[PDB]
């Protein structure tokens, strides 16, 4: 998929293990509790899933570790990555305890569902951590079981 | 088309006469259809809801029920 | 009396759409692991709330997860996909359709037991006679022999239908008909004025009406029209769509708490007050709304102290203020705020008592008062607010209420003020006289004697039951009765026939405490006699060695 | 443990207790009689 | 004249002429006259 | 304080009561549930809460003083108006 105009690097990396966007189960969000970063994140991951082909009705469990840990400026991504590798090995998708009441804005993101409590599943196949930084510094990593 | 918010309300406070014209109209509307046009005029609500409460509550909905529309079928 | 209300601490929960897909996706896996077995009433309940929040978008999410269910893996998976597609279909036919409070729980009763070791425990065992709520509704409405239609109540209800017959059969001269109700009224008045010279069942749950001589006498007409809806609720449920309501005293695990969830399952927006506004308390009410909040519903929690005049007027304002408030108008008011003033006779009405009385009466009235003037001023003329007055059967019959009875009794003057004073069409009064609710609340230690007292052919209630009953008087049928006439509503388990109830209880109270004490006493005695006879050594070496749990870090 | 279950297990507590410095291992005489295992870091006392 | 009430006696003697008049008038179906009697008896029981 | 003066042997007038006639009361005319004001809350405290406490005080006095065989007759001034009349304002509530 290296430089293929007809294959999104997301598709690629996933398909090489025999998976599609639909297998992408959990997305760990930067979700820093700031007004804009949380709209944006959903919006990006959403547009991503949509345009790739994600089949309507199949939502990604969205994780927001920051509620528990706070935002360690630099080590943010590492903590989240740990979380996912941990979800991967337990099939447990932790909930956002501090999800008072999700912003009505987040309704328009069909492909994302924000769990306020933990959910034990039959398993998760692949995940997507995504972080953003000062000075237009956006990164994303996809991990597979 | 020329309707504007709070129209003729200034003249309302200033003229004891016009004062009463509005009142009698409002008094009517409130007791029969369950809303005030004076309110609608002063502060233009993007929505408003009437309630069919007790004794005088039910009598209102009666008037809403007794609204006779008429459209004939293409057979007559 | 220290104010505690602060608009900045207000928490609004309204995100039903998300909690849906959660509780949905949550149930799916629940089945696959068997946390939910097809049996469990639970699943039913869950499904109904998922029905209550029915979006188009919910269906899409509902569907996909089903469509791809790996049935070939196990029964559970099949069982899931089944119940899944099942639910999805139901959800389809209830789009737009008002959400409903429907209590599918398994009616439960009280059961205290004394273990052979003297251990006293109290479970809540499924009622052997009822399984759905419909059964409860019936069981209630039917009656108990213990509530045998009294002489006067019989003489009356009979003479009633005598007139109803004689009357609605027009072929007798109006000379005689006219002269019948003459001799009829005579009988009724004489009965009322001097009963002493002249002279099937009663619900467990009945309304009443006032006599010419202000008496609250059992009215079948109402008790009917009520109980009817009460049954209609147990069946096809009951909606509160579009209604706004204020509730105080909705603490965790209280009657209010249940009633809350009730209205939350209808499309009801309610503002709940807490005098112990914590994170924990914040979270609790979230937990509720996450699982009860039907489409259209809204929960707004807020700190508040009904002991504070200031708070009262402040609260009310937040509620009505268009600009910076949450600009509502109230449909229900459920003033269940209350303090345990246990332990005091007129002997000693202390600080607490005076305070309690101020929460439970003076400020309560002021709470209603505030709401009224709000409506009056705001021109809200055609939308009376139904007040569920929590009245009591105890008007000094029980011991150390200490200013309790005084409050609960006083409240009843409202029955008349509704007529005399000028707030009739702003507030309506529904005097719910709540009966024994064994559910962990203001009658907790009264559970040991719960089944005992019930032995005498009378009934005690679980909270979910009482909430049901109350939500009943919340139903449209009754609400309209209130708009023309205050409503009495005896929701006492017919304990109106067990006299000296406090004596009975304390009697049972004793026995249970006594027989258990003896039992465990002896145990010590005898196991101590053994140390005397077999020596410390023999006895010591022969006791169940119960390993102490350690921890290993694997 | 915290992110997932919402509270610590005894195993968790022991780890936390260890790193926070509340308990430390001991392997010698405690008040004359020998002992090995967890000890309250503050008081020389043993902990179960 | 306001606090007027009738003795048990009057209550019966009034129940008498009510029944006597309504009955010796025979205008009612055997149903009504049947259960009118029915109801009358109950009343007369409870009142002794 | 009153009650104690009444019973104190030494410096009080060392009585024991046979009758108690608690007719203390304030005109709270003019107020509906509309507006239970300062006056009303005060009136209710004179007419009920402190009334009960007056009785209560007397009782404990007797109990403690061994006055066992001389009950004091309390003439409770109750009312026919339990909210039937207009602007009692907390009046009925006390009397009931
Ligand atoms: N259960 C029965 O048998 C029975 C009988 C007759 C009447 N009732 C009525 O039922 C209603 C509900 O009480 P309950 O017996 O179900 O339970 P409860 O244990 O008496 O509940 C009392 C609740 O009132 C709130 N509260 C306490 N102090 C307050 C204050 N100072 N200001 C504002 N709120 C305060 C608390 O809520 P927070 O924790 O959120 O602060 C608390 O959870 C009461 O009105 C009671 O009189 C019940």
Residue nearest atom 23 of ligand 1, based on CA coordinates? C249
Structure tokens at C518: 């003896």
Are B57 and C484 a contacting pair at CB < 8 A?
no
Collect all residues of chain A within an 8 Å Cβ-Cβ radius of residue C286. 100-101, 116
Please, what's the largest Cα pairwise distance for chain D? Answer: 44
Ligand 1 pocket residue status of C460, Cβ below 6 Å: no
Collect all residues of chain D within an 8 Å Cβ-Cβ radius of residue C553. 11, 14-15
Q: Which residues of A18-57 are buried (b: 16+ CB within 10 A; e: fewer)?
A: ebebbbbbbbbbbbbeeeebbeebbeebbebbeeeebeeb
Q: Are C138 and C231 contacting, i.e. CB atoms less than 8 angstroms apart?
A: yes
The DSSP H or E segment spanning F73 is strand F73-74
- Using only C-alpha atoms, chain B has a radius of gyration, in whole angstroms, of 17
Q: Are F82 and C413 contacting, i.e. CB atoms less than 8 angstroms apart?
A: yes
Shortest Cα distance, chain C CAs vs residue D18, angstroms: 12
How far is CA F55 from each of CA C549, F73, F78, rounded to the nearest angstrom? 60, 10, 15
Shortest Cα distance, chain E CAs vs residue C191, angstroms: 8
Distance CA C359, CA C376 (A): 24
Q: Is B30 on the interface with C (CB under 8 A)?
A: yes
Q: Is C369 on the interface with F (CB under 8 A)?
A: yes
Burial of E16 (0-12, 13-18, 19+ CB in 10 A): exposed
Structure tokens at B56: 């005088």
In this complex, the residue of C26, C64, C70 whose CB is nearest that of residue A57 is C64
With a CB cutoff of 8 Å and minimum separation 6, the contacts of B4 are none
Q: Are F94 and C365 contacting, i.e. CB atoms less than 8 angstroms apart?
A: no
Interaxial angle between packed helices C16-33 and C279-292, expressed in degrees from 0 to 180 and rounded to the nearest 10: 80
Residues facing residue A141 across a β-bridge? A129
Place of tokens 């388990």: C493
Ligand 1 pocket residue status of C251, Cβ below 6 Å: yes
Ligand 1 pocket residue status of C50, Cβ below 6 Å: no
With a CB cutoff of 8 Å and minimum separation 6, the contacts of C97 are none
Q: Are C375 and C321 contacting, i.e. CB atoms less than 8 angstroms apart?
A: no
With a CB cutoff of 8 Å and minimum separation 6, the contacts of C77 are C32, C69, C70, C71
With a CB cutoff of 8 Å and minimum separation 6, the contacts of F56 are C345, C346, C347, C348, C349
In DSSP notation, C348-373 reads G--HHHHHHHIIIIIHHHHHHHHHHH
Q: Is D2 on the interface with A (CB under 8 A)?
A: yes
Residue nearest atom 25 of ligand 1, based on CA coordinates? C249
Distance CA C14, CA F12 (A): 66
Distance CA C201, CA C207 (A): 14
Distance CA C292, CA C270 (A): 12
Report CA A77 to chain centroid distance, whole Å: 12
Distance CA C54, CA A6 (A): 38
The DSSP H or E segment spanning A60 is strand A60-63
* Centroid of ligand 1 to alpha carbon of C352 (angstroms): 15
Distance CA C479, CA C475 (A): 6
End-to-end Cα separation, chain D, in angstroms = 22
* Centroid of ligand 1 to alpha carbon of C282 (angstroms): 18
Place of tokens 């139904």: C386
Shortest Cα distance, chain E CAs vs residue C457, angstroms: 24
In DSSP notation, chain A reads -TT-TTS-HHHHHHHTTT--GGGEEEEEE---S-HHHHHHHHHHHHHHHHHHT--TT-PEEEE-THHHH---TTTHHHHHHHHHHHHHTT-EE---TT-SS--GGGGG-TTEE--SS-EE-S---EEEEEE--TTT--EEEEEE-
Are A92 and D4 a contacting pair at CB < 8 A?
yes
Residue C553: closest C-alpha in chain D: D11
* Centroid of ligand 1 to alpha carbon of C257 (angstroms): 10
As a dihedral over the C-alpha atoms of residue C185, residue C186, residue C188, residue C190, rounded to 10 degrees, the angle is 160
Q: Are C13 and C285 contacting, i.e. CB atoms less than 8 angstroms apart?
A: yes
Structure tokens at E44: 């007369």
Q: Are C431 and C488 contacting, i.e. CB atoms less than 8 angstroms apart?
A: yes
Ligand 1 pocket residue status of C442, Cβ below 6 Å: yes
Residue C70: closest C-alpha in chain A: A122
Residues facing residue C269 across a β-bridge? C244, C298
Ligand 1 pocket residue status of C390, Cβ below 6 Å: yes
Atom of ligand 1 nearest to the CA of C249: 24
Distance CA F63, CA F61 (A): 6
In this complex, the residue of C357, C365, C422 whose CB is nearest that of residue F36 is C365
Task: Tell me the resolution in Å.
Answer: 3.1
* Centroid of ligand 1 to alpha carbon of C342 (angstroms): 13
Chain F neighbours (≥3 Cβ pairs under 8 A) are C
The DSSP H or E segment spanning C126 is strand C120-126
Distance CA A13, CA A26 (A): 16
Distance CA F15, CA A101 (A): 68
Q: Are C395 and C408 contacting, i.e. CB atoms less than 8 angstroms apart?
A: yes
C254, C353, C435, best to mutate for ligand 1 pocket (most atoms within 8 Å of CB): C254
Of residues C442, C495, C435, C498, the one with CA closest to residue C466: C435
How far is CA F5 from each of CA C403, F8, F9, rounded to the nearest angstrom? 26, 5, 9
Are A107 and C22 a contacting pair at CB < 8 A?
no
Distance CA B48, CA B29 (A): 14
**DSSP letter (8 states) at residue C57:** H
Name the structure determination technique: X-ray
Interface probe for A, chosen from C12, C15, C55 (most Cβ of A below 10 Å), is C15
Are A68 and D6 a contacting pair at CB < 8 A?
no
Shortest Cα distance, chain A CAs vs residue D17, angstroms: 19
Structure tokens at C246: 């204020």
Please, what's the largest Cα pairwise distance for chain E? Answer: 40
DSSP H helices, A23-95, are 35-52, 66-69, 76-88
Structure tokens at C12: 């609004």
Cα four-point dihedral sign A110, A111, A117, A120: positive
CB atoms within 10 A of CB B57: 19
């Amino acid at each position: 998929w290296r430089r293929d105009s007809r294959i999104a690097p997301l598709r690629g990396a996933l398909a090489t293990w025999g998976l599609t966007i639909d297998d992408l189960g959990v997305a760990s969000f930067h979700g820093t509790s700031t007004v804009a970063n949380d709209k944006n994140e959903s919006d990006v991951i959403c547009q991503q899933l949509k345009h790739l082909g994600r089949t309507k009705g199949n939502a990604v469990l969205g994780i927001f570790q920051k509620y528990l840990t706070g935002h360690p400026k630099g080590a943010a991504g590492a903590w989240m990555l740990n979380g996912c590798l941990q979800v991967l090995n337990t099939g447990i998708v932790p909930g956002n305890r501090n999800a008072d009441n999700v912003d009505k804005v987040m309704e328009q993101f069909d492909y994302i569902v924000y769990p306020s409590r933990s959910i034990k599943t039959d398993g998760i196949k692949a995940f997507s951590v995504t972080s953003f930084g000062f000075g237009q510094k956006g990164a994303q990593a996809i991990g597979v079981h | 088309g020329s309707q504007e918010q709070g129209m003729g309300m200034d003249l309302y406070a200033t003229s004891p006469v016009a004062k009463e014209v509005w009142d009698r109209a409002d008094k009517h509307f409130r007791e029969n259809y369950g809303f005030s046009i004076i309110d609608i005029v002063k502060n233009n609500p993007k929505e408003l809801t009437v309630h069919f409460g007790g004794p005088r509550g039910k009598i209102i909905r009666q008037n809403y029920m007794s609204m006779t529309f008429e459209t004939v079928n293409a057979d007559g | 009396i220290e104010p505690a209300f602060d608009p900045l601490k207000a928490r609004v929960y309204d995100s039903s759409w998300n909690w849906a897909r959660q509780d949905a996706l949550s149930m799916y896996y629940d089945i696959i692991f068997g946390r939910l077995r097809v049996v469990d009433r639970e699943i039913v309940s869950q499904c109904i709330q998922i029905m209550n929040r029915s979006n188009p978008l919910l269906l899409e999410f509902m569907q996909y997860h089903i469509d791809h269910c790996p049935t070939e893996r196990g029964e559970t998976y099949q069982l899931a996909k089944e119940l899944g597609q099942q639910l999805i279909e139901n959800c389809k036919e209830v789009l737009g359709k008002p959400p409903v409070y429907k209590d599918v729980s398994i009616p439960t009763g009280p059961q205290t037991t004394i273990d052979a070791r003297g251990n006293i425990q109290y479970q809540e065992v499924p009622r052997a006679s009822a399984r759905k709520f419909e059964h409860y509704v019936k069981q209630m409405a039917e009656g108990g022999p213990i509530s045998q239609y009294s002489n006067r109540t019989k003489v009356q209800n009979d003479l009633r239908s005598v007139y109803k017959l004689i009357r609605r059969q027009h072929r007798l001269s109006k000379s005689s008909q006219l002269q019948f109700n003459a001799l009829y009224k005579d009988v009724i008045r004489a009965l009322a004025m001097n009963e002493s010279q002249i002279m099937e069942t009663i619900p467990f749950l009945h309304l009443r009406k006032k006599d010419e001589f202000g008496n609250w006498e059992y009215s079948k007409k109402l008790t009917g029209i009520y109980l009817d809806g009460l049954e209609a609720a147990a069946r096809s449920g009951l909606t509160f769509q579009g209604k706004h309501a204020l509730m105080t005293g909705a603490g965790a695990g209280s009657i209010g708490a249940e009633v809350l969830q009730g209205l939350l399952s209808g499309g009801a927006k309610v503002i709940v007050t807490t005098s112990r506004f914590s994170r924990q308390v914040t979270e609790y009410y979230q937990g509720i709304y996450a699982r009860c909040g039907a489409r259209g519903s809204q929960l707004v929690v807020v700190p508040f102290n009904q002991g504070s005049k200031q708070d009262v007027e402040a609260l009310v304002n937040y509620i009505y203020d268009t600009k910076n408030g949450l600009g509502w108008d109230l449909d229900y008011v459920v003033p269940f705020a209350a303090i345990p003033e246990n332990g005091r006779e007129i002997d000693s009405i202390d600080s607490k008592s005076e305070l309690a009385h101020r929460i439970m009466l003076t400020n309560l009235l002021r709470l209603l008062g505030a709401i009224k003037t709000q409506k009056k001023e705001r021109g809200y003329e055609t939308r009376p607010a139904q007040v569920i007055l929590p009245l009591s059967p105890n008007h000094g019959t029980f011991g150390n209420d200490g200013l309790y009875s005084e409050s609960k009794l006083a409240l009843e003057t409202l029955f008349n003020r509704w007529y005399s004073e000028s707030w009739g069409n702003y507030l309506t009064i529904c005097g719910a006289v709540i009966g024994w609710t064994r559910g962990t609340g203001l009658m907790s230690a009264n559970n040991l004697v719960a089944e005992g007292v019930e032995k005498l052919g009378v009934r005690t209630f679980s909270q979910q039951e009482m909430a049901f009953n109350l939500l009943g008087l919340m139903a449209p049928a009754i609400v309209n009765l209130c708009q023309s006439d205050p409503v009495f509503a005896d929701l006492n388990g017919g304990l109106q026939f067990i006299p000296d109830l406090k004596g009975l209880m304390t009697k049972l109270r004793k026995e249970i405490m006594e027989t258990s004490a003896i039992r465990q006493a002896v145990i010590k005695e005898t196991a101590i006699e053994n140390k005397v006879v077999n020596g410390e050594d023999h006895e010591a070496l022969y006791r169940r060695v119960i390993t102490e749990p350690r921890a290993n870090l694997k | 443990e915290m992110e997932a279950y919402g509270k610590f297990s005894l195993e968790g507590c022991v780890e936390m207790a260890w790193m926070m410095g509340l308990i430390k291992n001991h392997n010698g005489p405690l008040k004359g009689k020998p002992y090995s295992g967890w000890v309250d870091a503050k008081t020389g006392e043993p902990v179960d």
